[model samples]
Structures are given as C-alpha cells and as structure tokens.
Target chain A: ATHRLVMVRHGESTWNQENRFCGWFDAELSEKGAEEAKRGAVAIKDAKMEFDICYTSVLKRAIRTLWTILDGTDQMWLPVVRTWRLNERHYGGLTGLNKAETAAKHGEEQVKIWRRSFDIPPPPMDEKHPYYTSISKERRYAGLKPGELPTCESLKDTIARALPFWNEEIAPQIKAGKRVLIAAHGNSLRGIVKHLEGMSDQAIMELNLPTGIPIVYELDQALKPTKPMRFLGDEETVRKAME
Target chain B: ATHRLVMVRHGESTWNQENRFCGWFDAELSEKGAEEAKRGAVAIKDAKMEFDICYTSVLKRAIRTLWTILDGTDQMWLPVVRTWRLNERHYGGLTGLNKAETAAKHGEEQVKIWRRSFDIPPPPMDEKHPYYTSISKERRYAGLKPGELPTCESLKDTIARALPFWNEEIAPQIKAGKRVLIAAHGNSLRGIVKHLEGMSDQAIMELNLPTGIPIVYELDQALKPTKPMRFLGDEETVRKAME
Candidate 1:
C-alpha cells in the first residue's frame, strides 16, 4: 500500500576506484562501470519492476545510470525529469585533483576532513583553474544563482539545494501515487535517505548506496515506509560496492 | 531576418528498402540508415549549425535519426519534443505488408490509390491482427483516443492532425527566434512543407523530402517564407540518396 520510492547511486565513476571526491564534475562511465549499470538493470528486469516516474541528476553519469536501468526494464523512452538538485555535492577545489596524490602530499586527515566534513568545502576552485575553464560552458548553470554554482558545495550545501527540489518536485509525485525511482550521486542520495528515514548526520553518513543497485522503498496508503529498502543486486556485490 | 528552420527526413528505416507502409508503426533504422543520420549530423556540425530545440516524431526511426544528428553535433542534451502529430501519415491496411507484394496482389492502381489518395483510408486495421495487438501493448502508445490510429490518412487528414500542432507548438517557438530543427518522416515533413509553400495536394504528392539531408527554411519577420529552401549535402550524394 506504500508509494514506493527507489534510489540508485550512479555506477562506479572513474573517481570511485581512486577514492577521489567527484563532486559536480562530468565524467563518462568506464566500461566496467557501464557494465555494472547494465547488471543493475538486468537485476531489476528479473524482478519485473515497473514504475510511474523517474528522477536523475543533470550529470550524464547519473542520467546514463537511469538510462541503463530503464533500458533493461524496456522503458528507456519513458519521460524522465532531470534536476541539478540531485547532483553530487560539489567537491569545490578538490575536483579534478588526484585523491591519492593529494593524500600523499597533504596527509590523510586533511583530505578526510575535506571529503567527509558536513560543512567544509575544501576551498572554492577559481574560474582560472584548469579544470574549471575547460568545460565551464555548461547549460542551465550558465546564468544561475550562487546556490547553483559548482565552485563549492558541502554535504550541507547539497541538502540545502536538493531537499527543496525533492519537497517541491518529487514529494508531490509520490503523494499523487507514483512509484518513483531516483538516480543520483552517493552523497545526494544519502541526503534524501536521511530526510526520509529521519537518520542523524552521523547515522546517515554510515549508510552507503552501491553503484548501479536499485534500492526499492515500499510505502503504505499514507505514503509511509512499509519495509526496509532492498537492493537489486546480490548481497555480496551490494556489500562490496559500499566499501 | 528569417529564423532558421532545419528539416530532415529520418534515415532509411528497415521497411524503407523493404518497400513497406511504415507509417506510425515503429521501425528501427537500418545500418545504412543509421550511417546516413550520422553523416547528416556531421554535415551540420561541419557547417557549425546550432539549434535551440529539436522536434521529432514519436516513432523510433525519427527518434534514432534525431539522436544520431545530436550525437554527431555533440548536442545530445538539447531540449527535444516528440509528438504523434509529427508521425508519418498512417498507412491503413498496408501497415505490415510489403508494398510491392501488395501492389502485385491488389493491382498497382489500388496500391497507388491507397498511397496517394486523400481522405480515403485503405482499410482500418483490426485490433485482432497480431500486429495491431502488439502495437496496442507498446508503452510508447499507452493512451490513445478515438481515431488516433490512422488506418490510412489522406493528405487532408495528415494536415488536419499536423497543422494544429504547428500552430500550437512549433510556430510560436520559431516566432520567438529559436532555431528549429524537425526530424520527421517523409509524409509528415511533406505536409509541413506543403503548407509552407501553399502547395496543392497534387503538388505535395509529387514532392518528397529526401532522407539524410538538412533543409533550412528562412522565414520573413511575418513568418512567411523569405527565401527558397536549400538542402545541404553534396549534390551527387543527395542525388544518389533519392535513387
């Protein structure tokens, strides 16, 4: 009886394997990452899952993840609503820098503080930065507000941007009895999970969604959660993905 | 100054070479068709053309053609609108049968009448036909109204369906100074062109928009044609395509 809401973290971005902060950056999925998404779709197909609406970040990786999942479900051409609100919290200055090299140079604590902190944004990357200037001519954000900038965003910043969009756009669809699927980044999905499950900052930080897995939420008539979310992939793979 | 409108036919569908009536019935582009679409996009890209919005038919052939063009231009993320109104005129009883075979069986005169005559539909497809049942179940066509299925459409029926969409959706945007690109089928594009040129139904029957060529239309400030339409691509290539 619940209005089910499913969430998926985008498949292993090239940065994921290198343990880097991949906030607000555009990167294509590696072949293995793409296959992971395909596998996720196969799993969903096996269960014959169907949904009323879908959500994904404006970023291609997340968009491609949704594409793969829906492709598997034979629903590739379904209307999709893409929003920057679900994008990964911008890693600010850390984007495009090598995480391993940074750790080696700056020590792990500083890198950890920058990566995991709720409010810190590593320092904004200037427009003059090499990566910033390379692909800066982005759509939608070309003339947007300060909150829309990728120059900087902490997890808190992500919550600030994402929650309003969820409350304004997605919540109503769920209220209208839609079975919704959200394709987004690791931190952005975490933000939604925290809000929905009433998890504290500390508790939410521990909950990780694996790449490509479809985590389904079953709700009752009142739109309340009826059962624990289920990942479409095997338990071992799911566990491995979170690490 | 004229707002530029680029019109292009979808590349050869699998049914195109097979000489079948493919209107409204979804058909994938052949390998050659896909290459044609790609080449069409490349030509546009080489010319440094940019479009604000793209319009296409609901069927996969047109969609695939649009996708290829956008992909070639690296403009895949541009806003796109798909409507059944842009679909090729529905070929009634001939939906799945081979055109030459039907001609041989039904006589060439009968086949020509069905293909060219306005207002007279060849014959309504029975919902009981395996093809009809399969079509009815497709997700792309979940909700259909009475007579939405064209057993066959004369130029009149096609114009009736297409003109409203032009007024309601396409013209307003063109008037607003957006560069418009329409990726559609032969009959659908012909219908639009016929209206633009004030061609008689007889003239429209003889006019064909060759596949895989971008045709740019320049309209005056009053939205009337300011200049003649010009087709892009080498003359030899275009001549060969029509053959």
Candidate 2:
C-alpha cells in the first residue's frame, strides 16, 4: 500500500510582503496570505485530501496555516504535533532585513550570488539585531538543547536538520500507515523535497514551493516515492518561488 | 509556594446566540464571542499572566479561544493539549435545540427545574437525533472505550467524568509546578470548581461561569487554594450565567 504525505508552505507571512528575509522571526500571515491559506484549504477539499495527523513548526505562520486548513476542512480535532526541527532555515543576520536594507548592506549583486550559492551560509545573526529578540526572547525555544539553536543555516545545514526529523519522527509514523500533513516554510520543505526525490543540491534549487498550496507525495513501503510528487494545482508557482 | 491555574470559559458560539443548550455541538465562535475572546486575551495580558501549557476540549470553540488568548498574549507557541474530557458536558437530547424548541419540547417550568436540579440530567439523546452525527462521525472520539460515549449526562454524571481527568491528567501537571491554563465549557469548569472548593451540589447553583473571562485559582502545596479564587474581571457574570 502506498502512503501519501502532504506538505504545505505556510501562506505568505507579513515579512514576505515587506520582502524581508523572515527565516525565524515569526512574522504573522499577511492579509493575502490568510486568503491564500483559505484558498489552499479549498484546494485540499477539492482534491479530497485527508490526514491522520499534522506536523508543523513552532512558528505561528505554519501553525496557523495548519489549523486554518483543518478548520476549513472540518477536521479541527485532527492531532497536530509541532517541533522546532520543522522551522524554516534560520537566516541569521538576515533574519528581518527588508529588501532595500539587504541590498544596501550586502550589495544587490552579492546578495544574488549568496542566494544562488548552495552550501555557503550567510553571516551569523548578531545578538544586537532588532529581530534577534524574536528568537532570543521566545519562550518556545526554551526547551532547546545547546547546539539545536542555529545562528544561521545554509540549505545544506537546513537539510541536515530537517532530514533527521523526517527520518526519526515522521518516517516512522508513515511506516505505521499514518497519512501525514506538514505545514512549514520554504527551506524546510525544500530540504525534505530534496531528500525525497534524491535530487542533487543544484537540482533541488529548481524547485520552488509556493505558499498555501499542497504537494502530495505517494510513497512505497520503504518510504521511497512511487512516482514524482504532484502539486494540487499550478506547478508554475513551485518553480517560480525558488529564486 | 502557590500554583496558579487559569481557566477561561470559552466565548459564545453561533448556537449560543440562538440560546441553544450547545453542549458538544462543536459550533464555531460567534462574532461577538470572537471579540470577547480577544478581550479575554487582553485581560490575560493586563494581568501579566503567563502559562507553561494550555489544555482545552477537542471541540473548536474552546480550542479557538485558547489559541486566540495565547495569540493575544503574545504566547503563540505556548504548548497546548486537547482532550475529549475537557469537552462541554454533553447536552444529549438538548444538543443544538434552540430555546423555543427546548421550551416547546420539555416545557418551560420543567426545563427550569431540570437546569437547577443538582443531579438531574436532561433527556438522553436518541441515536437518530440529527446532532448525533457530530458525536458518532467524530474521529476524535474513535479512541474512546465502550461506555465512554454518553447518550446524556446530569451534573452528577458530568462530574464523574470530569473529575477523573482533573485528578489524573491535569492535577499531575499542576502538581509538577506547571503554570496551567484551561479553556473549557461552563459545566466542565463547574465540576472542577465544585471539587476544588468542596462546594455542595446544591451550592454549585450559586456559581455562574460566564463566557470569555478567566478565573484564576491559586492553590497551595496541598492542591487546595490558600485563598479564594479571583475572576480576572467582573464576578457578577459568573453568578448570572448559572441561572
């Protein structure tokens, strides 16, 4: 029997609207983002997707998206688990820099190169960055062990964290015949997708997971996908958002 | 040392607007009720209340209120636990019956007597009742053992179910020095209140638990409150709702 795993990138956060690098800052859903989530909910219903349990990051954007989709689908009581491992790739010093600020600080051309680089991580987040409070002051992260907190993450660093959670926590559940829904951010989803498809790091860069919509992966008994995953709709947005 | 447990009666639901009995109906929060929950969230903020974890019913209204309060309090990632035991005391046959319908079916005087009676339960919900689908079709309750699903319940029956959860699930958490928050229904809250205060069954009629406000119970090491519990705001509404 094939098991289905559904993953949703959270609807656009307020930081996304401002073109801020919002990795771990926990910006809320923007108006369009909330609407996008509702639309995603409708798409889930349209596709007749069902879930046994859901997993999301501790971040509100992902949590809200998860709940909104379940509420819309009249499955509010569905069991949900949240973990810091599912969080977006930490942006470090770039956590909340707006587009203009980022361009000014790092240079537009340099930032473009940085974005395209696969293994190179950005600068570590300075403790003094205003957005650092979002991470430092959050009680949600109080339970984190010493090295679990990240200063920043390259895609490679992100996949290193994301893949373990997929293997140890989620993969076991799927093997037990549970259908899983994951609500998370782009980089985290990217890390999982990269692993799932056995893509090269460079090949993984071609995938762009848009907000709100779902990708359904049908997996075999050993957890390998039976075939290529399909988006509920509009494969183009998935390709567009990677850059 | 004292442990503070905060309990908020969930905000009004759409069925509440129609003056329905509304136990376990799984209604969404009403327009005003949403505002009330927001206001309660503010009250939580104003009181400088912080929570380690939140517990609520499987039903959406309580779950929504819990998250809303945590969101408003800027504790969006607060740990949350939802259980069927925290659900509103089952209304059984009275589930979803509008006030007029209730009066027509059970007679105004008898219904009043039933409402005030300490041990008396309303009519048992028939298996064929339209609202029975909410309970039967709810996968949330699929794990329940036989005799766990109730056809009806008196306050006595309600307490029997509710007190076990309080003693087993919640009390352990409270005992372990967790600053606890509970979002639940009036009757379930009442059952706990009765146990906490050692109130007589008849004396409980004097207690009213209004929607959307918090009752803070500060218990000593022995699990009995060192002093009387305090409402976050107005106390009169608590008394008024019981009638």
Candidate 3:
C-alpha cells in the first residue's frame, strides 16, 4: 500500500482578503478562512484519512488552521511540530503593502518579473520598516541564531530551506509508516509541491494551490508519487477552492 | 539560578460543573472554564513567564486549556507534547455518575470514605458500561498496549502512573534549563504536587487545587522546590479559583 501525505495551504488570512503581501508577517485567519479550514477537515474525515503526526509553520495563520483540522478530525492528540522551515517566503520590503497598489506604483512589468522569476526576491526589508523589530524580535524566533533570520527569499530560496525539513524530519516518518499532514502557507507549500513532483520551476510558478483543501499525495516505497495530487472534497467544492 | 515549572489544573469542565465523575470521560470546558483558562494565560503573561515546552493530557479539556494559554501568551510556537499519563484518575464505573447522586444512592459516609481514602479505588469499569468500549477503543489510546489502559485508579495509582512521565520526559527538560508549563487535570496536577512537595497522604487529600490559576514552583538545581508554590493573580482572584 502506498503512504499518504497531506498538505494544506492555510485558509484566507486578513492579509489575503486585503490583497496584501503576508509572507512571514504573522496574520490571523479571517472568518472565511476559519470556515474553509473546517470544510477541509470534513473532506479529510470523509476520505477516512487519519494522520499520525502534523507539521506547521510557526505563524499563527498556519498553526491555527492545523488546530481547526485536528479538532475537526478528532485527532488533536496527534503530535504537532511547528518550525520556521515551513514558514512562507519572506516578502521583505513588500510585507503589508497592497498588491494592486504596489503594481500600480512600481509598474506592472517589474512586479511581474519579481513574481515570475524563480531566483529573484522582492527588495529586502530592513530596520526602517515599521514592523521589522516586531517580527524579527518575535519570541518564537528568539531561538533562531543571529543572521539566521531571513530579510527576503526567492522561490528557489524557499524551496532550498523547506527541503531539509522534509528529508530530515517528515519524510522518514512516512517512510517508516506514519501518515503525515502539513499545514503551511502558499509559497512554502509551493516549495514542497515543486520538490515532491520534480516539476519545472516555470510549471510550479503557474500553479496556484487551493487554500483549505487537502492535497494528498500517495507515494511509492521509494518516495515517488504513485499518482497525481488528489484534492479532497466534491468536484464543485474542490473547483471553488482552486479559484 | 533555578528552573521554573508551572502547572495549572484545567478549568471547570462540563461534567465538573455538573458535579459528575469525569475520570477518563472526555468533557469539553464550560464557558466558565474557558474564561478561567484565558485568565490563566493572562496570569502567565502578567508574570512575564515564558515557557520553552508544554505538556498536557491527551484529553480535550486539558488540550483546549493549553491552546488558550498558548494563544493568550502568544507563544503558540513552543513545543507541546500530549500523553495519556497526564490524564485524570479514571473513576471507572463512576465515569458518568453525578457526584451527589452517587453520594445519595451509595450513602454519604461511604462516598466520603472513597473520596478521602488515598489507596481505595472506585469500582472497576468493564466492557459492560455504556462508554467503556468507546473510551477503551479511542484512537488516541490505540498506541497503548493491551492492559496498559486502566479500568479504575486510586489516588496512589494515579500518582504512580503520572510520575514516570514527569521523571522521564518533563524533569530532564527542566533540569536542562527548559521552563515548563503543564496544563492538565486535577488529580494529575495533584500527583505532581505531592511528588514535588512531599506532602503527607492525609494532607495531600485535603489540598484543593485552584483551577485556571498559574502555580509556579521555583526548583533548585537538585529539582527541589526552593519556595512554596506561588499562585498567579491577586489574592481575591486566587481565592475565588480555590473555592
């Protein structure tokens, strides 16, 4: 039998609704996000999927989504490990900036290049930013060593950071027979998807992950995907989430 | 310098307010209990108490209490470990029975004796009890080996089970400099208190744990309590919790 690994992008956050760049900026999920998470849990339950361990980004948006999933699935007892490795790519200077506003201010083509490029990160965030001290000095990250904090990250950078955690902590468990669930942000989940499927960087850029929908990968013994990612929920519901 | 170990008995559960024996019966926190847990978090926050790790029972009441504490304190990223060892003393056949009803039906003195005695256990629960199969078959306990589940437990037995977890998992972390917070049940907290203070059995029975209040113990290098347990919050609030 193949092993199952589930990944979910957290539901819509306040930043998401406001069309702002959240990146590593911590945001609570909006009301709609909470309901999306509950629906995601129902899909998992309907599919008879149970997880042995869970992993999530240290950010509240992802952490709270995992909470809803665990509570809904009656699996709150499962071990949960929160790590910075699973965090969304740092948006740097773009954090809290409205996407449309930035596009209009900085020219569409330039913004397009930043979003489309695999190796190009947005401008770096520095001490001048109002939230720099608050996010950087967060107690959660106090354990992170000096200079380990990211001021910015590209898609490649996000993938490079997330893969080690997969190989070291999460993969071995699945290889050894544990079902795994991961709740995280868009870019981080994008990183894992790119890595797992070995999809071309260009292909991954076009892929918009469905929020609050469980994307389950059934993997062979060698950790190769036995099938395409299966989205949980009915056809119409899953379609609605993809948009 | 010393280690700080904080423990809080979960706030009043639904059954707790109903004066029923909760024992391994899963109960959600009442509205009052939820408020108590929020207050517990506020207390911890006001004290500037930060935790490196947290431990809780697999049961939901304790788990929800931990959730509130972590959320209120904005320390959701701290590691949390849940285990059955921290569960309340299983009341067996008394699981769902109201305390007063049982007292009236079985006679007050015998109930008093049962309540007062440290070693005497309530009647053992078998598969015949309505909730027996459900609790025993719970997926959270699936990892437990056959005979690992308790049918009934005395105060002494409760202490016996809880200490191993404390010794093996929690104490070493504290000794190694991790500030620890444990959100757990009444009897489980009692077990830890007994071990920490070396209180006599008779005296320990009379010790009423204040729910939802943070109790901090400053432990010396040898893991000895350096001072009496300090409850967080003002005198009136603390007294209210105790009652």
Candidate 4:
C-alpha cells in the first residue's frame, strides 16, 4: 500500500574522469561511466522493480544512463519525460574548468564555500563565456523564456526550480500508483531528496550521492517515507561515496 | 513558402539482411543498417535542413535510426515523439519467415498478392504463432486497446490507420511552418506518401522505397506536394530500389 520511487545520479561523466567542473557543460560519459551505468542496470534488474514512467534531465549523460537501465530492465517502452529543471547545478563561470585549477585561482576556501555552502552560488557566467554562449544557443532550452535559463545556481536555486517539477509532474504519477524512476544529476537528485526527506540545508550540504547508484524510497499513502532510503548496490560503494 | 517534410524508411533491419518478413516483429538494425543511418544523416546535414520535431515508431530500429540522424546533425536536443502507428505493416503469419522460403512454400503468385496488393491482406497471424505470442507480450503495445493491435494489414488498412496520425499530429506542425522529420517503416511511409501525393492504390503497389534514403516533399499550403519527391542520395540507388 506504499508508493515506490527510485532516484539515481548519472554514471561518471567524461568530465568526472577529468576532474572538471561540468555543471551543465553537457560532457558525455566516459568508458568507465558507461560501465558504471551497466552496473547500475544490473542492480536495478536484480531488485525486480518495474517502472511505468521515467524522468530525466535533457543532458545526454542522464538520458543515456537511463537508456542503459531501461534496456537492462527490459522496460525500454516506458514513457520518458525530460526537463531542463532536472539539470545539474549550473557551475556558472567555473562550468568547464578543472576543479583543482579553479580552487588554485579562486582560493581553496572560496571554492569550498561555493561547492559546499547551500545558498552561496559561484559567480555568474559572462554572456561572452564559451559555455554560457553555447548553452544559451542550445535548442533544448529554446522553450525557456528570457531570464528563465540559469547562469548560476546554488542548491537553493536548484531546489526552487526542481521542486516544482516534482510537485507538478512526478508526484501525480506516484500518487496514482505508478512506479517512478528519476535519472538525473547530483544536485538535482539532492534537491528532490532534500524535499522528500525534509532535510535541512545544512544536512543536505553534507549529503553526497554516488554516481550510478539507485536509491529506493518506499512512501506510505501520505507520500512520506515509510522506511529509510536504501541504496541498491554494494553498501561499501555507497559508504565510500559519502565524503 | 512551401513546407518541407522529410520521410526516411529505417535503415536495413536485421530481418532485412536476413531476407525475413518482419511485419510487427521488432528486429534491430544490422551493422550495415546503422551505417546506412549515418549516411542518411550526412545527406540531411548536407541539404542544410533542420527539423523542429521528429516522429518515429516505437520500434528500436526506427528509433535508433532517428537517434543517429539527430546525433549526426548535432541536433540531439530536438523533441522526438514515438507512436505505434508508424510501425511496419503487420505481415501476419508471414512474419519471421524467410521471404524466399515463403514464396517456395506458398507459391510466388500468392506471395506477390500478399506483398503487393493494395487492399488484400495476407492471412491473419494465429495467436499460436511464435511471433504473435511474443509481440503481444511487449510492453510498448500494452497501452493498445484490445483488438486494436493488428494481426495483418493491407496498404489500405495501413493508410487508414496511419493517415489519422498525419492529419492530427504531423499536418498541424507542417501547417504551422515547422519542419518535420519522420523515421518509420516501408509501408507506413508508403501510406503517408500515398495520401500526400494522392497516388492510386495501383501506383502505391509499384512503389518500393529504399532504406536509409531521405525523401523530401515540398508541400503547398494545402499539404499537397508542390514538386516531385526528391531522394537525398545517389539517384541510381533510388532508381534501383523501385523493384
């Protein structure tokens, strides 16, 4: 009599391997990232769950990871919905830089604050910046009105944007007893989880989600969690993922 | 001022290479089929055409072919819509059987009637047939109403079923001056072409579409073709494809 939801972060991206700050840069998954997606699929398949619908960000990393999992679970026919609101936290001016280099340039403490502080966003990307210019021209976001697209997003901004989608699109299906799967980015998943668990901003700042892991939540009729969220893979991997 | 529509039959499916009757049976693309899709993309890219939306069958071969084309054009963000109406014609009991063997078993005359007749459908697939049993269980068509899933279809039936989609979904977009791409099957495209060009049933019988070739139709405000459909590939190949 409980509603079930599965949330997953995309597998390792090409920039993840390069130690870069991708944040909406649309970098692809690395070979290991694809392998991680396959592992994610295996974990889902072993769980014997079937989803009627799936939600994902427009980014290829999340889309492709969801594709692999659907193939693995023999649920490729499920309806898939993609939205810009599910995208990774926009890294702003640091969108494509190496994380270490950014820390060196901006000072470690400032970089740490931007990365970890719930409300503090990185500096806004200049219109002339390659990442901003390119993403602004992308057809995927063409539907968004002017000023709707993000140049910078803190966790607060991401939650504000993503929570509406959860309320409007995802929750209705869950209430209707449809099994739901969401394949998205770290911060996007964090936003959803933060809202679902009612976690404080400080608590969410310390929460880290491992890539290619499916976190399952069983919610009672009231849509509140009936039990603790369980990661559907090796506990050691989840433990290692939490910083 | 004419609206441009591009229709592509999916590249060589595994059944195509195997010389089997695919019908409602879902078969993946052969390696050569994938290459053909890439070439189709190149032809589209060279023509300098961009589509606002894409439509394809729920079948993987067509879906993957469209995916390849979108990726080739760096327009992967384009919205894609899938429908069962765009699927290949139902071949009935002939599905999964080698065409040559069917001709040998059922006689060439009978086979020709099944393959080329406009209103004459072949024998309905028995529920006991292996292909029918398997395809019936597919989740993609789980949403279809009882008896809505066909066991066999003539060109006439295909047009009847597929024309509604054109009138409802595709024509509206074209009327709005939005460019559209359709990746589908031989019969489904034939149905649309037959309706678009107002070709006779006999004329449709003589028409054989080449896989992976992009056929461009420039339509007037009334959705009638303003000029002869042009194949975006080598003329010899398109000419040779008409058997």
Q: Judged by DockQ, which candidate is best?
A: 3
- Give the candidates in order of lDDT, highest first: 3, 4, 2, 1
User: Which runs of model 4 end up more than 4 angstroms from their true locations?
Assistant: A233-243, B100-108, B233-243
iRMS value of model 3? 0.9
Which DockQ values do the candidates obtain, in the order shown?
0.36, 0.56, 0.77, 0.43
The C-alpha lDDT values of all candidates are 0.77, 0.84, 0.89, 0.85
User: What is the lDDT for A228 in model 2?
Assistant: 76
Clash-forming residue pairs, model 4: none
Writing each residue's lDDT as its tens digit, candidate 1 over B150-212 gives 656776788788888887899999998888899988878887888788888888888877788
**Which should have the higher lDDT, number 1 or number 2?**
2
Best by lDDT: 3
Per-residue CA lDDT of model 4 for B47-100, tens digit only, reads 888999999987888888887898778766566788888888887878888977
Docking class of 1: acceptable
Per-residue lDDT of candidate 4, residues A84-199 (tens digit) = 99999988888888977898778998997887788888988888786876786776787887888888888899889999999999999999989999999989998888988899
How high is each candidate's TM-score? 0.88, 0.91, 0.94, 0.92
Ranking by TM-score: 3, 4, 2, 1
Stretches > 4 Å off in candidate 2? A107-113, A233-243, B107-113, B234-243
How big an interface RMSD has model 2? 1.3
- For candidate 2, write residues B111-203 as lDDT tens digits: 998888878889988878888876756677877898898888888888788889999888999999899999998888998999989999888
TM-score of chain B for predicted candidate 3: 0.95
Expressed as tens digits, the lDDT of each residue in B64-114 for candidate 3 is 999999999988888999999999999988888897778766788888888
TM-score of 2: 0.91
